[PDB]
Amino acid sequence: QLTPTFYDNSCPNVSNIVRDTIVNELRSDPRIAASILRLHFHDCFVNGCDASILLDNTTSFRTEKDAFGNANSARGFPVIDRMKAAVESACPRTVSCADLLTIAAQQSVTLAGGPSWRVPLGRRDSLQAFLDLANANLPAPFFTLPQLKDSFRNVGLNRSSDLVALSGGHTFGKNQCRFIMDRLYNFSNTGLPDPTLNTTYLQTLRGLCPLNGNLSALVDFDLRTPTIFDNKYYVNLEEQKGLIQSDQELFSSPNATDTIPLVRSFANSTQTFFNAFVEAMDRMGNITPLTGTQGQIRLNCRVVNS
Ligand code: HEM
Ligand SMILES: [Ca+2]
Numbered sequence: 001q002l003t004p005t006f007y008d009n010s011c012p013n014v015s016n017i018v019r020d021t022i023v024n025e026l027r028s029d030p031r032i033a034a035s036i037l038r039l040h041f042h043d044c045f046v047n048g049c050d051a052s053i054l055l056d057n058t059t060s061f062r063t064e065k066d067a068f069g070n071a072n073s074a075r076g077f078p079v080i081d082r083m084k085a086a087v088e089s090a091c092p093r094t095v096s097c098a099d100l101l102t103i104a105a106q107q108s109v110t111l112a113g114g115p116s117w118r119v120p121l122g123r124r125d126s127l128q129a130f131l132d133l134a135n136a137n138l139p140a141p142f143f144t145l146p147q148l149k150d151s152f153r154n155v156g157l158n159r160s161s162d163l164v165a166l167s168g169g170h171t172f173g174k175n176q177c178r179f180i181m182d183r184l185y186n187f188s189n190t191g192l193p194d195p196t197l198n199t200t201y202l203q204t205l206r207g208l209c210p211l212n213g214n215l216s217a218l219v220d221f222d223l224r225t226p227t228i229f230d231n232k233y234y235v236n237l238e239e240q241k242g243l244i245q246s247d248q249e250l251f252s253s254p255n256a257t258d259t260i261p262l263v264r265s266f267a268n269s270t271q272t273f274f275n276a277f278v279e280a281m282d283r284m285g286n287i288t289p290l291t292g293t294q295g296q297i298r299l300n301c302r303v304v305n306s
């Protein structure tokens with residue numbers, strides 16, 4: 001059983017070391033908090049939160065870093081190496097990369113203005129990476145609501161609240177033009193923009209992402225507060241201003257009878273959202289963890305111990 005007090009005796013300063021690292025990095029890279037939270041999400045959706053995503057290539061297994069959802073998208077790996085080294089110095093061979101990344105995600109959310117809580121701990125590190133599983137398990141922005149629900153249920157999150165609350169991670173961070181080009185110019189081969197995208201916002205996005213333009217150009221997920229972790233993401237959805245298809249479907253999909261009330265509830269109360277986010281975050285963080293003597297306490301998050 002994972003417990004928030006796991007390192008209270010072996011490494012009481014772990015959370016503070018993680019926080020300090022993120023604070024330092026945020027000065028030069030204001031996007032790092034968002035990037036780290038996403039790394040934890042992509043770690044947990046593939047064989048559970050086991051730091052499998054942090055492993056680099058080997059001749060026996062490919063890295064998840066080359067999965068369609070991670071390649072030229074996932075970032076922050078060097079920062080994780082930095083805090084790991086700092087933690088290893090303070091507490092040699094004690095904190096797993098899986099736990100480190102979980103704490104980092106929580107601290108990132110808090111530093112961005114979100115809720116503060118102690119995450120359950122005790123996870124251990126994987127002995128391999130899972131590229132095929134990552135390609136199969138990570139959701140895509142073009143997924144329909146039924147597909148998004150399927151993706152979450154596939155890893156163990158059955159509740160619509162899990163999906164709606166965790167999608168709140170898009171209250172900050174960046175998204176490449178490539179992922180919304182269809183919504184802007186030719187949605188579902190209709191030759192027209194996605195009708196669920198506010199027409200005024202449509203114009204703005206088309207200006208940032210012109211046809212035949214730089215597909216790697218970055219756009220803010222939350223037009224209200226781009227770098228602050230708050231409930232503004234849901235207010236945008238109510239106005240048809242969700243950035244990607246998967247965001248807006250939570251409010252506009254024909255299958256959204258169960259998600260609409262959640263979207264409204266989170267848009268109406270920061271407290272309601274923050275509570276739901278913590279609850280869902282801990283549930284995602286409890287996905288098939290390695291515990292006890294299973295797996296290892298990886299020393300270098302990029303390679304399995306030898
Ligand atoms: C519900 C399905 C989801 C889909 C389809 C999805 C899709 C995406 C896409 C397309 C990007 C842009 C990547 C890029 O342009 O490089 C992204 C970024 C991001 N996602 Fe999601 N996401 C989902 C759920 C979540 C969840 C559950 C979290 C965390 C709780 C999360 C946190 C983030 C963050 C913070 C970013 C910004 C990262 C950065 O700026 O470096 N996402 N997501
Ligand atoms: Ca994983």
Ligand SMILES: [Ca+2]
Nearest residue numbers: 171222225228
């Ligand atoms: Ca925001």
